[PDB]
């Protein structure tokens, strides 16, 4: 874990989403990214490993799912795993369980376990109510048009 990303939260703006690219164990994480091969340097040298995905979560609970699908395409991006951390739910009015696509099948994502995001078709962080995307098989145009009402989807 210590090679890898973490999901913070800060209290600036009221709520904001930090996501490091460190190679150090940052704790305090919500969410985690597993890389399986290299990451990338630029990502490390040109954000200094700080990176802040979005803020103002007060004004909207929304803002912190939408901030999670931001956080799970770096792991897309860097073609890693996506590791969904428990914790902060306990503390953060924010319980959530998230799911990815992968050709007409629905995957949710394992507490505290990288998962394969990287050849993923789409992503969406859904709440415990996460049935609208917990079936046996999905559209990935579905996917993404109900985890936006969800309000958090990305697809590619």
């Not at 164990?25 to 979005?54: D, H, Q, S, W």
């Not at 994502?109 to 049935?131: C, H, R, Y």
Request: hydrophobic letters at 40%.
């Amino acid at each position: 874990e210590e090679k890898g990303a973490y999901l913070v939260f800060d209290n600036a703006s009221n709520g904001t989403l930090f996501i490091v690219w460190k190679k150090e164990k940052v704790e305090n994480a919500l969410m985690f990214i597993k890389p399986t091969k290299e990451v990338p340097e630029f990502k490390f040298v040109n954000r200094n490993g700080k990176n802040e995905l979005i803020r103002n979560l007060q004004s909207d609970k929304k803002l912190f799912y939408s901030g999670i699908c931001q956080f799970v395409k770096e792991a897309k991006d860097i073609k890693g795993k996506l590791t969904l951390l428990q914790h902060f739910d306990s503390s953060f009015p924010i319980k959530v369980d998230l799911y990815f696509l992968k050709g007409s099948k629905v995957m949710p994502l394992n507490t505290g376990e990288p998962f394969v995001v990287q050849d993923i078709d789409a992503m969406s962080v859904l709440p415990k109510g996460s049935s609208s995307l917990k079936v046996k098989t999905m559209a990935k145009d579905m996917f993404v048009s109900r985890g936006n009402t969800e309000g958090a989807s990305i697809s590619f």
